[PDB]
Design a protein around this ligand. Structure first.
Ligand SMILES: Cn1c(=O)n(C2CCN(CCCn3nc(-c4ccc(C(F)(F)F)cc4)c4c3CCN(C(=O)c3cnc[nH]3)C4)CC2)c2ccccc21
Length: 219
């Protein structure tokens, strides 16, 4: 297994997004993970629609749009819906709306998804190295998280009760500190150009490896 990866370097990560007041971090984590698989499969990097997930992957998938939801069930919707629209065709509005999915603008598809075992940072590392970026949840309910600007994030009072969806797009070590490279959905002004490096191999720090999952686009 490699010592560092960074999927941005293989043009598999889209630009950082800005969720704003709507609690759709889950949807941004989901589309992030699938964007990468679409690139690998097709060579084309296209931002997929979070608003589509918010509007259409709803109570039938255990989701509540701007009030929260899960990546796993988002991935199921895309399997069930037999498609997801492009961001360009179904733009993010940071509010709940009627479902406006149109298969004419389908930009990707999803065949299956996998969940990783809880708390297994060795397994998460393997998946990130061998499969692509991985959707995870983190415990982001801490002032130090919102105020993070750079370096390797470590919060002594972090828990493994995750509440905020993000994308693991790499890992590495910086000056002795092992980290995971995490794309967030708070725009470019957050952290390191929209990214946060987070403590790795520090006992499932902030629950980063509590609920990982990733999609696959077959055939
Ligand atoms: C109607 N209907 C549902 O309801 N389902 C459920 C939706 C998700 N469930 C829970 C998954 C586990 N699970 N997933 C998160 C989770 C994942 C990601 C995020 C975020 F998006 F923010 F990233 C937030 C929470 C948390 C947990 C358990 C407790 N949690 C912890 O963090 C924790 C565990 N040990 C210490 N702490 C939160 C299982 C089924 C349905 C599934 C199919 C069809 C219809 C369905």
């Amino acid at each position: 297994l490699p010592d560092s990866v960074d999927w941005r370097e293989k043009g598999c990560v889209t630009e950082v997004k800005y969720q704003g007041s709507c609690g759709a971090s889950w949807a941004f984590s989901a589309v992030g993970a699938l964007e990468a698989q679409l690139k690998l499969k097709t060579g084309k990097l296209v931002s997929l629609s979070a608003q589509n997930l918010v509007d259409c992957s709803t109570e039938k998938y255990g989701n509540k749009g701007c009030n929260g939801g899960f990546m796993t069930t988002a991935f199921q919707y895309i399997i069930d819906n037999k498609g997801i629209d492009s961001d360009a065709s179904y733009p993010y509005k940071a509010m709940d709306q009627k479902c406006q999915y149109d298969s004419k603008y389908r930009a990707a598809t999803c065949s299956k998804y996998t969940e990783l075992p809880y708390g297994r940072e060795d397994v998460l590392k393997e998946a990130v190295a061998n499969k692509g970026p991985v959707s995870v949840g983190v415990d982001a309910r801490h002032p130090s998280f919102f105020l993070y600007r750079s370096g390797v994030y470590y919060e002594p009072s972090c828990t493994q009760n995750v509440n905020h969806g993000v994308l693991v797009v790499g890992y590495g070590d910086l000056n002795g500190k092992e980290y995971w490279l995490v794309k967030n959905s708070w725009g470019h002004n957050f952290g390191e150009e929209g990214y946060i490096r987070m403590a790795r191999n520090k006992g499932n720090h902030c629950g980063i490896a509590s609920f990982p999952s990733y999609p696959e686009i077959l055939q």
